[PDB]
């Protein structure tokens, strides 16, 4: 609200479609949306629980999706050297994290 | 000097001649020679050698001059050293005369090849038609080094093709012998006796062999040819004549003119398909004008008689005026007045060509507009190539000009354009030019397809199979609809991997100036390659493409044969030694004054003397 941007909560699993790429596609599209809407907060929803929110992260697609986001961040400081869209992670558990992360 | 013919209208040659004096001051004779070819200053080249009085410099100049051929093969430019070694006044050297009457450049071409190597071939196959293709290609693939033993060995390999095909097969032994003085000896044994196709074809093989080692011969082909002419053999003498014409290229002498001239006035064109010998005179007296040749050509053009209705000589006599007038720019205007005056439909074609040839490598506004008038025929469009290849902007101008030929659908129109692509792009392959050429392949006219594959062979030159492999497979898939196509495709491979794949046809030089000879070679082969291409002729004309050949090389020398290292960064070997091949790169250490590619004497500060 202070930095003057849309707060975008993204549900990790909802970016878990059972078809070819369509899912992989959604992941890519999202980055496209938030690049257009720059600046933006991407808040990675579903590696936390507010009580009314299901799934705190899992061995499926929440930790892997959390790796993907990091990759994107590397690439921006790369070719374009423009970066105005920041990702905020929230977690309660150190079992979703690994030291290179 | 680069700017004057590059950027503006380039009419005035005041600038060029003036630059030449400034070059004397600071002792860049290397740039002074480069100006001196093109303008047609025979005088300058000799005068710069006279100013030189340093042996280091003397031998280094002789090497970089060798590259522009026409002023090295030509007498009293090589023999400035020969006149003045006899009694000293110029400190001309003995080892140096062995450079100027070429032996040692050709020896290091061999040395390079033995050292960094390239593969052998055989393959004669069988059937007459296949044999001739395979025989021709063999000689091209092992050109520039004697490996003719295989051909000689199988007498049946030799035998199988007949008539004028036997003339070629025998003669291919000559292609393998080319650039090598020793190889003349070996040839003699086949020459004597044999079948008459063997006899005749030897003489053609001697003319191919001598192309680039005629200048200071060891076997006198003129004497063998002279004898032959008095002998019956109306037909054979023609091909004999093409070979000696090829042999006598670059130089000029009265002797060759005397043998050729009466043969040209025979009129044995209608029946034998002989009397081509004006073409041969044209090729000997390149870049220079002798009036006897000119008048002969002109009056036989005016005739148009029942004998001279034979359309083959007309293609050659067309070409002939332009080759005699290549490079001489302004002075040619005298010849042009005579030409314009003798009105014919044949002649209008020849106007644009003479002007193209003469202005070659620098186009002008007059020339572009004049060629567009003609267009709205083959010679006007082919001329565009000659002007475009010296010019950066002119290469881009090509895509615009050849647009026109593409917007028409007419079959004639389609067929002409691929030769013109072939002539410009000879130096290095141009991929945008290849995208256009693919389309020209797949047409419902056979003759367009034939010229496209001869064009791909021209354009790919200086390099082997790049994108070309994938094209070379598609060409192969058209043998099944067309007999001609196999032969032409076989020729393309031979050209693409000519002289063991490391030799080129190019307008880049050890002095970075276009070579008048190389241009004429390509031009004359482009119209009239093989019997069903154009007007009925001979397959035999293909050997004329030999004139085109320059080998790629940088050899650094610290002395005269001692090695000195350089590293240069070719295909990925990358970071090669001296004594190898490179293109568009130069030495990383300092020449006497030249700092240029080719056979170079390199010098070091004695404090940080390095030698390999």
């Amino acid at each position: 609200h202070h930095t003057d941007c849309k707060f975008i909560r993204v549900s990790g699993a909802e970016l878990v479609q059972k078809y070819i790429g369509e899912g992989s596609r959604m992941v890519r599209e999202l980055f496209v949306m938030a690049r257009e809407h720059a600046p933006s907060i991407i808040f990675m929803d579903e590696i936390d629980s507010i009580g009314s929110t299901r799934v705190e992260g899992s061995g499926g697609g929440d930790s892997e999706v959390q790796r993907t986001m990091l990759e994107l961040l590397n690439q921006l400081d790369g070719f374009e050297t423009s970066k105005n869209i920041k990702i905020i992670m929230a977690t309660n558990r150190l079992d979703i994290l690994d030291p290179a992360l | 000097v680069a700017c004057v013919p590059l950027l503006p209208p380039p009419e005035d040659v005041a600038f060029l001649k003036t630059a030449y004096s400034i070059y004397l001051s600071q002792n860049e004779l290397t740039d002074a020679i480069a100006l001196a070819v093109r303008l047609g200053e025979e005088d300058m080249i000799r005068s710069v050698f006279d100013a030189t009085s340093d042996p280091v410099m003397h031998k280094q100049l002789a090497y970089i001059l060798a590259a522009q051929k026409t002023s090295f093969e030509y007498e009293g430019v090589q023999d400035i050293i020969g006149n003045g070694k006899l009694s000293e006044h110029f400190l001309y050297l003995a080892k140096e005369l062995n450079l100027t009457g070429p032996k040692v450049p050709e020896d290091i071409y061999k040395s390079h090849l033995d050292n960094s190597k390239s593969v052998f071939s055989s393959a004669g196959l069988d059937s007459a038609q296949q044999n001739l293709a395979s025989s021709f290609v063999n000689g091209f693939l092992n050109l520039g080094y004697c490996n003719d033993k295989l051909i000689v060995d199988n007498d049946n390999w030799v035998y199988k093709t007949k008539g004028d095909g036997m003339t070629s097969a025998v003669a291919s032994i000559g292609s393998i012998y080319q650039w090598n003085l020793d190889g003349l000896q070996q040839l003699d044994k086949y020459l004597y006796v044999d079948e008459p196709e063997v006899k005749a074809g030897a003489l053609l093989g001697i003319g191919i062999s001598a192309s680039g080692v005629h200048d200071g011969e060891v076997e006198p082909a003129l004497l063998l040819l002279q004898d032959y002419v008095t002998n019956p053999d109306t037909k054979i003498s023609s091909a004999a004549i093409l070979g000696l014409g090829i042999a006598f290229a670059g130089s000029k002498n009265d002797e060759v003119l005397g043998l050729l001239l009466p043969i040209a006035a025979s009129t044995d064109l209608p029946i034998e398909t002989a009397a081509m010998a004006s073409l041969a005179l044209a090729h000997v007296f390149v870049g220079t004008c002798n009036g006897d040749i000119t008048t002969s050509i002109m009056d036989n053009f005016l005739e148009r008689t029942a004998i001279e209705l034979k359309t083959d000589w007309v293609r050659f006599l067309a070409l002939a005026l332009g080759i005699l007038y290549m490079g001489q720019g302004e002075q040619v205007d005298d010849v042009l007045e005579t030409i314009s005056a003798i009105e014919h439909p044949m002649t209008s074609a020849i106007e644009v060509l003479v002007g193209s040839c003469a202005y070659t490598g620098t186009g002008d506004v007059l020339l572009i507009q004049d060629l567009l008038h003609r267009l709205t025929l083959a010679y006007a469009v082919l001329g565009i190539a000659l002007i475009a290849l010296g010019e950066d902007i002119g290469k881009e101008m090509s895509l615009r000009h050849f647009g026109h030929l593409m917007h028409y659908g007419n079959e004639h129109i389609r067929r002409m354009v691929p030769l013109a692509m072939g002539i410009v792009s000879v130096s290095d392959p141009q991929m945008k030019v290849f995208d256009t050429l693919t389309r020209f392949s797949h047409d419902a006219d056979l003759e367009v397809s034939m010229n496209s594959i001869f064009a791909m062979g021209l354009c790919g030159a200086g390099t082997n199979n790049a994108r070309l492999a994938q094209l070379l497979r598609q060409l192969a898939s058209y043998y099944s609809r067309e007999q001609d196509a196999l032969f032409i495709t076989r020729l393309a491979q031979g050209l693409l991997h000519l002289g063991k794949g490391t030799m080129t046809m190019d307008v880049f030089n050890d002095a970075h100036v276009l070579n008048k000879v190389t241009l004429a070679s390509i031009l004359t082969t482009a119209v009239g390659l093989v019997s069903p291409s154009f007007m009925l002729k001979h397959h035999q004309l293909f050997y004329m493409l030999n004139a085109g050949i320059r080998p790629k090389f940088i050899l650094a020398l610290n002395d005269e044969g001692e090695p000195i290292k350089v590293n240069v960064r070719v295909g990925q070997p990358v970071l090669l030694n001296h004594g190898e091949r490179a293109e568009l790169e130069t030495d990383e250490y300092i020449s006497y004054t030249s700092h240029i590619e080719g056979v170079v004497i390199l010098k070091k500060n004695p404090d940080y003397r390095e030698e390999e």
């Binding site: 890519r28 892997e64 590397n74 070719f79 050297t81 290179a100 | 026109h404 994108r467 990925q572």
Partner: protein
Amino acid sequence: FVSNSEILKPFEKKQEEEKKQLEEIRGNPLSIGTLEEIIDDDHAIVTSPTMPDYYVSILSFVDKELLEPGCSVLLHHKTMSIVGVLQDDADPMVSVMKMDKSPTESYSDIGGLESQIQEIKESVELPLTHPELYEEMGIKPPKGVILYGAPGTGKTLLAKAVANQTSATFLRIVGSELIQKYLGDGPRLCRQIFKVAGENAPSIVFIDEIDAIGTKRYDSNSGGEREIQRTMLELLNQLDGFDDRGDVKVIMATNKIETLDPALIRPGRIDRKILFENPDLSTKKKILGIHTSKMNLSEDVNLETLVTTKDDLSGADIQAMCTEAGLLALRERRMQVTAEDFKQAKERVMKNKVEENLEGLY
């Protein structure tokens, strides 16, 4: 110029007349559909959404070889004739791929990796520099290399540098997203990645952290999860079964190269196996010098001093230090950085990395 004009005057009249004869066909409504297959009688079968399917002869704007089975095409609204080719719609599904044209990074910025930089240069870089050169020689240089260390310390960086030099498209492939929980699904996702790589050559294909789709096991298929095994065999078949000269180069990444099947490594594609050395004192100086060129700082900061007291820090820790000392300056509202900021910064990252468990020593 003059050339344009010669052409304009006949070209005009023919163009209008052709443009017209096309537009009478092309007139609306014409439905889009997709070309199923091209039959060899020079017909073609087309799949329409609205349920005509017909065998029709082409009409030009394209040629029969300018079309392939499965292409999108324009269809007539009663005979379903192929008037022209069109470009896919209603969402082409393309798999996660990140495009980086000339990613801004060089060898110079990360110098002191000297030994690795030559290895990647010979194998990857110089073949891409020589395109017609790889076509003529025909023999394989290295197709592919493997880089193994820690990401964003050399592994990410090295591949970014070489991409900048050769003007190749750099393609960052998320190892894990290929880890879809379905069947059939992993290999067709993997295949799609390779399809696009060959189409849009030149490119370097950087496949980030393959171990989630991998895991070697003891058998080449096992009664555990099938999806993880499926993606792995497709990946092994994709190196083994199509080979390139120079048109596509593969850089593979993994933290541990020993969790990969030894036949998925496969010599004769991946010839180079590149590993990570630790910084010595002199490298620490070099890596530090670059990072401070881009800072502004106080002149009481001494590089030599910081370096000596650092021992066993990799470059990642060196980068973190620049940001942490610089953060205390940003807190004090200052765009210099003092000596003091660095000392506290050096000490802290040093402490956390350098955890003791008495496993050193001996």
